[model samples]
Target: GVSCLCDSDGPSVRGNTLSGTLWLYPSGCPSGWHNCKAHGPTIGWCCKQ
Candidate 1:
């Protein structure tokens, strides 16, 4: 695995029911990835594991 953008299997994401906005708080980068962060979209960045 290598540094890649957020995806269904890359990092965990959530949606705010009140604001209807998405959450990109660096969590769960799977088995081959690490260091997740919100890079400004519904997506984000994750470093290689």
Candidate 2:
């Protein structure tokens, strides 16, 4: 999994959140994506680019 700013290709967040660990990506969705803050644990927000 990966995450980044809405206009960047760099990954702001990456790694395996397979279990109880709650890892928040430093940046939100990548280019053409939106930051869904309402998304709960284990779920990250990203657009369909």
Candidate 3:
């Protein structure tokens, strides 16, 4: 499969509970995305784009 910050199959977001907060690289989500602060937003962390 192919994707990016686009329409079809947008950013590759993963359900990371910070299962390794300081884990994975920054290349998680596509551009214009962020790994929100490792705190409780109910789900603690989410791959936001």
lDDT of 2: 0.36
Off by over 4 Å in 2: 1-25, 38-49
Query: What lDDT does candidate 3 reach at residue 49?
Result: 46
Q: CA lDDT, every prediction?
A: 0.37, 0.36, 0.35
Clashes of 1: 0
Best by TM-score: 2
| Runs of candidate 1 exceeding 4 Å displacement | 1-28, 36-38
lDDT of 1 by residue, 1-49 (tens): 2333433333345531122223333553445545334442445334334
Per-candidate clashes come to 0, 1, 0
Comparing candidate 1 with candidate 2, which one achieves the higher TM-score? 2
- lDDT score for residue 22 of model 2: 23
Candidate 1: give the clashing pairs. none
TM-scores, one per candidate = 0.20, 0.23, 0.21
User: How are the candidates ranked when ordered by lDDT, highest leading?
Assistant: 1, 2, 3
